[PDB]
Amino acid sequence: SKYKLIMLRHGEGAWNKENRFCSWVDQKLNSEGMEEARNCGKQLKALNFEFDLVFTSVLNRSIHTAWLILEELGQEWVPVESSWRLNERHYGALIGLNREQMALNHGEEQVRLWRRSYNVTPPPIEESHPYYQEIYNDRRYKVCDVPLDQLPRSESLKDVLERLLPYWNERIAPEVLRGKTILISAHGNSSRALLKHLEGISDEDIINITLPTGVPILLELDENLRAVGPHQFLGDQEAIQAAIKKVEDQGKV
Amino acid sequence: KYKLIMLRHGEGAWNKENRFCSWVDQKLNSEGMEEARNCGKQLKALNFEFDLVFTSVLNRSIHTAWLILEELGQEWVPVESSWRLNERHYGALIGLNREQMALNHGEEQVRLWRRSYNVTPPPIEESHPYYQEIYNDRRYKVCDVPLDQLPRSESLKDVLERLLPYWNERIAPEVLRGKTILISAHGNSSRALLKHLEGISDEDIINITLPTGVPILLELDENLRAVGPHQFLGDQEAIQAAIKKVEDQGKVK
């Protein structure tokens, strides 16, 4: 392909382990996630990647992942840019809830729909939600390209792509066309959103795409920035498929 | 009136070994990392809310900045790194033991090499043990100045000449815009900026030594000139002692 870029989902976190929808809650990576980030950097180093620019969300877990990757590459000097438009999909009222418990109470299929549907919008989070305050009172959301009151309170995967695409078009895509090697440290669903766009995945097929944590995703693009072949997870396919199954199994029981 | 924070990163392995590090990209050791976290805690106590962070391209200043932002929960704050904030280039003296130099050339000469404004260290030659790793690094192949035009040694005067343009053009404008800035730099690059901002004479700058891992508070007026001398944040006795420690590295037992 004419261009190559790397995107990935950050490493494991406390909630990623307790199996609770984290979303816009600024939870940190745990020891296991930090190591995943380090292994990503080692895999990228083994493949000679030399980044010119890194894009992250404003959730610290995606930022720390990038930092750990850069340290392993000895590329801490590479410019980093962060944007809420790369933030994980907003789970609204579901934030904080245990996936397996919801599966038990509502049915595996119901939870699977909420998690992977392109169109279903979660119930908006309310000021009465246990984590509303610790989200909308943070200064990082007072300096976004849109007023605090204009930020979403819940999003379907479709909503995510709608607020992420502008950033890709205006800030990231231009750099890729310039020949720069870009690294995107994002999240599970915000990453699924960008892949849908780049690979032209249908609304139906995007439902079956689940991304493993801490695994480099190589995308090869043509002159029009359209993927030339499905995304490629860099690493041992067997261990990567088990990690994907692990994510899927979070909604089973 | 405007206030900003600048500091020198924490200790590295060559600190206890008493060897000029300069442009060698040495990482912080355990102690240096802790020094950064302590700076972060102090800044958090003062409720600092940074808007921008400027660092050099030496990873120790970058890691220091990252640790401070983590302590503050401000990892999303924009960071910019430039070689123009790099520590003074010690030329051929890089890697040499400061006390050994004092025994070989005398304390007076060592003092001139370390703190004088106009004395230039002998240039580093291709045969020098640390030449390769420095000029072979990609971070210097993408600077605003060709790799072949980068200094091979610098007097404090040389440092100010390549650092001042960066301050005036990229940092000072943010200060005038009321932004809260953090400058994570080095011993002599910080001394060079202080000399300018405080209008310290070529002679008096020789007596200014900065301790590692200590927040430096500086207030500037409408003309971006120091309202008063810089101040060190923390236990003054421990600070003066740390300053003496640095001074004593250039003296005979």
Side-chain angles (χ1 to χ4, degrees), chain A residues 1-3 5-15 18-107 109-126 129-132 134-136 138-177 179 181-203 205-237 239-251, chain B residues 2-15 17-131 133-135 137-141 143-146 148-202 204-252:
Chain A
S1 56
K2 182 179 181 183
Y3 304 108
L5 80 67
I6 294 298
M7 61 175 84
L8 53 81
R9 187 186 177 181
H10 60 73
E12 179 185 305
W15 278 23
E18 295 177 54
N19 192 21
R20 299 172 58 180
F21 290 119
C22 193
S23 190
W24 283 40
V25 175
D26 204 21
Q27 283 293 306
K28 291 192 166 189
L29 300 172
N30 57 21
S31 61
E32 300 94 300
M34 288 172 226
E35 197 61 54
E36 291 191 310
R38 287 183 177 289
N39 288 331
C40 182
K42 297 176 182 177
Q43 176 59 279
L44 289 168
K45 184 177 184 183
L47 301 171
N48 314 315
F49 280 87
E50 286 178 348
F51 299 104
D52 302 303
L53 179 45
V54 179
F55 292 99
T56 79
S57 67
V58 292
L59 294 168
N60 79 250
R61 56 187 185 282
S62 80
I63 295 167
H64 277 291
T65 289
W67 289 351
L68 288 169
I69 287 174
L70 295 180
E71 168 170 21
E72 290 298 326
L73 292 165
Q75 289 170 37
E76 297 99 316
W77 56 272
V78 175
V80 170
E81 282 187 48
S82 308
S83 174
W84 77 274
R85 291 175 179 286
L86 285 183
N87 271 30
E88 176 61 304
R89 172 269 277 285
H90 200 318
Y91 259 116
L94 304 187
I95 291 181
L97 302 180
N98 181 287
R99 302 189 183 78
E100 198 192 316
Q101 188 169 184
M102 286 196 99
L104 174 63
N105 298 312
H106 304 292
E109 314 91 293
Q110 185 65 77
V111 169
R112 179 144 46 66
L113 179 62
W114 291 333
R115 301 180 72 196
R116 300 291 170 264
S117 173
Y118 179 56
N119 303 114
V120 182
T121 301
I125 186 172
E126 305 200 304
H129 186 91
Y131 298 89
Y132 182 88
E134 77 171 62
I135 292 179
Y136 297 89
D138 190 293
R139 182 169 61 104
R140 77 194 70 191
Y141 297 122
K142 287 198 176 66
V143 295
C144 292
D145 52 23
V146 295
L148 176 64
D149 62 291
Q150 187 179 305
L151 291 176
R153 261 58 181 182
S154 76
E155 316 171 277
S156 62
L157 184 57
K158 184 174 185 292
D159 289 325
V160 175
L161 180 58
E162 269 167 35
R163 49 80 157 171
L164 180 157
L165 187 58
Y167 193 61
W168 165 264
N169 285 159
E170 296 158 47
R171 192 75 203 78
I172 309 176
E175 297 294 355
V176 177
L177 281 179
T181 299
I182 282 60
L183 165 67
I184 302 179
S185 185
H187 309 263
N189 298 314
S190 57
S191 286
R192 283 174 65 235
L194 183 57
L195 290 181
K196 190 180 190 301
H197 179 70
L198 302 187
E199 283 174 88
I201 300 175
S202 68
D203 297 351
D205 294 318
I206 189 62
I207 308 297
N208 307 309
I209 303 298
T210 286
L211 307 176
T213 62
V215 176
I217 307 179
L218 166 64
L219 275 293
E220 308 207 75
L221 309 177
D222 56 44
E223 67 165 59
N224 301 303
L225 298 182
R226 296 184 191 183
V228 293
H231 50 278
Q232 181 185 333
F233 296 107
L234 264 22
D236 164 48
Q237 299 317 104
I240 291 173
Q241 283 305 309
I244 289 173
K245 186 177 179 299
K246 182 171 64 178
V247 173
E248 306 179 319
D249 290 346
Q250 291 185 299
Chain B
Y2 313 95
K3 289 191 176 182
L4 69 70
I5 298 284
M6 76 173 75
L7 54 80
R8 193 186 173 179
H9 59 76
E11 177 192 306
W14 285 9
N15 279 80
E17 287 181 52
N18 191 16
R19 297 167 65 187
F20 293 114
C21 190
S22 186
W23 282 40
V24 172
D25 200 27
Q26 188 175 80
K27 292 191 170 187
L28 298 168
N29 55 23
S30 288
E31 299 92 301
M33 296 176 182
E34 265 303 82
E35 284 180 271
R37 294 187 172 289
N38 293 334
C39 287
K41 297 176 180 179
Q42 289 175 299
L43 296 170
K44 181 178 178 177
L46 298 175
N47 192 67
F48 261 84
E49 287 183 339
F50 293 105
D51 297 309
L52 299 162
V53 175
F54 295 87
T55 80
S56 70
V57 292
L58 296 173
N59 78 250
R60 56 190 186 271
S61 76
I62 296 169
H63 276 284
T64 290
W66 290 347
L67 289 170
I68 290 176
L69 292 184
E70 182 175 6
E71 283 304 325
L72 293 161
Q74 292 169 36
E75 297 97 324
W76 56 271
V77 173
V79 174
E80 182 178 298
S81 314
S82 172
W83 76 276
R84 290 180 181 278
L85 284 180
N86 265 26
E87 173 59 298
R88 174 267 285 284
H89 196 312
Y90 260 123
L93 299 181
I94 291 179
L96 300 185
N97 181 289
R98 303 192 183 75
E99 187 174 325
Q100 186 71 64
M101 290 304 94
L103 293 175
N104 295 7
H105 313 288
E107 283 180 30
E108 303 180 87
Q109 184 58 48
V110 171
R111 181 163 166 286
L112 290 197
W113 278 321
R114 299 179 78 201
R115 304 281 172 272
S116 76
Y117 184 58
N118 313 93
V119 182
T120 306
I124 190 176
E125 299 294 312
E126 297 200 311
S127 56
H128 188 286
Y130 298 87
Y131 183 93
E133 60 179 70
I134 293 175
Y135 300 87
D137 196 294
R138 183 170 64 101
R139 79 196 66 187
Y140 300 120
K141 287 190 177 73
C143 290
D144 44 27
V145 172
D148 63 72
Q149 296 181 52
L150 286 173
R152 262 52 182 187
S153 71
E154 291 175 312
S155 62
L156 191 62
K157 180 177 178 180
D158 288 320
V159 175
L160 183 57
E161 302 191 332
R162 48 82 160 173
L163 184 158
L164 185 56
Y166 188 70
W167 160 264
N168 284 157
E169 292 160 39
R170 303 186 68 77
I171 303 174
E174 304 295 359
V175 175
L176 280 185
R177 283 154 50 58
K179 305 302 176 186
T180 302
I181 289 65
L182 167 63
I183 299 179
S184 183
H186 307 276
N188 299 309
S189 50
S190 287
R191 288 175 63 248
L193 181 56
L194 290 175
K195 187 182 187 300
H196 170 69
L197 293 176
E198 296 183 38
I200 301 170
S201 73
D202 294 13
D204 292 322
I205 194 62
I206 303 184
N207 296 312
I208 300 299
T209 292
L210 307 173
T212 66
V214 175
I216 302 178
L217 324 174
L218 188 57
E219 177 174 44
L220 309 180
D221 59 23
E222 288 286 49
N223 300 314
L224 299 179
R225 318 316 312 188
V227 172
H230 60 273
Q231 305 183 319
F232 298 112
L233 185 64
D235 186 298
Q236 301 305 293
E237 283 61 55
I239 292 169
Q240 285 308 308
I243 290 177
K244 186 174 189 301
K245 193 73 170 184
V246 176
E247 299 176 320
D248 293 348
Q249 292 181 311
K251 298 184 175 186
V252 181

